């Protein structure tokens, strides 16, 4: 979807997931934007409802919840976790991060930029383009959130 719409949908759940886990707010958002293509990747349930699974987290035997089966083209079938909300999805994502001791420094970073350093040290992605893209995403999100905040107060002084 449009970047502004994506940010509007995911900002609050990422903030709440950040409070729960310690993972920086805009790091979660940046990874979600980056990996879903600002929501262009949609993973729907069989009846068309959203799965809210923005990261594309696969359903395996360690998942107790609902799943959705996506078949892509040779033909290939994959199972994804189904969530009831973006908040549940991002909460599950930072829990998965939290569960892995190698990413401890991510859960104690004070800024998104520090969090991105921590991910890179932990070896989150081997392709060095991922860290470059994440750095740029974090910068873009900072500018966007500034712009939103000014739309709010610029508007309020209508009245
Ligand atoms: Cl995918």
Residue numbers in the entry: -1 to 71, 79 to 164
Give the published text.
Members of GH family 73 (GH73) are β-N-acetylglucosaminidases that cleave the β-1,4 glycosidic linkage between the N-acetylglucosamine (GlcNAc) and N-acetylmuramic acid (MurNAc) residues of bacterial cell wall peptidoglycan (PG). In some instances, GH73 enzymes are associated with bacterial pathogenicity, for example, LytB being critical for pneumococcal nasal colonization and cell division, Auto for pathogenic listeriosis caused by Listeria monocytogenes, and FlgJ for biogenesis and function of the flagellum, which is a major virulence factor of motile pathogenic bacteria. The domain was found to adopt a lysozyme-like fold common to other GH73 enzymes, which consists of an α-helical subdomain packed against a β-lobe that forms an extended β-hairpin motif. The α-helical domain and β-hairpin of StFlgJGH(151–316) together form a groove-shaped active site, with the α-helical subdomain containing an α-central helix that houses a conserved glutamate general acid/base (E184), and the β-hairpin, in turn, containing a second glutamate residue (E223) previously determined to be required for GH activity.
To explore the structural basis of FlgJ activity, we determined the crystal structure of the FlgJ GH domain from S. typhimurium (StFlgJ) to 1.8 Å resolution. Interestingly, the active site of StFlgJGH(151–316) was found to be occupied by the C-terminal α-helix of a neighbouring symmetry mate. The C-terminal α-helix StFlgJGH(151–316) packs into the active site of the symmetry mate via hydrophobic and hydrogen-bonding interactions. Hydrophobic interactions were found to occur between L312 of the helix and F204 and Y249 of the active site of the symmetry mate, as well as between Y308 of the helix and L183 and Y286 of the symmetry mate active site. Hydrogen bonds occur between Y308 and N311 of the helix and K289 and backbone amide of Y280 of the symmetry mate active site. Residues 223–229—which form a loop connecting the two strands of the β-hairpin motif—were disordered and could not be modeled. Similar results have been reported for the crystal structures of other GH73 enzymes, indicating that the β-hairpin is likely mobile in this family of enzymes. A superposition of the StFlgJ and SpFlgJ GH domain structures with Auto reveals that the C- and N-termini of these enzymes are spatially conserved, which suggested that FlgJ might be auto-inhibited by the C-terminal α-helix, in similar fashion to the auto-inhibition of Auto by an N-terminal α-helix. To determine whether the C-terminus of StFlgJGH(151–316) autoinhibits the enzyme in solution, the full-length StFlgJ GH domain, StFlgJGH(151–316) and a C-terminal truncated form of the domain (StFlgJGH(151–301)) were tested for activity using a zymogram assay. Contrary to our hypothesis, we found the catalytic activity of StFlgJ to be unaffected by presence or absence of its C-terminal α-helix, suggesting the helix does not regulate function.
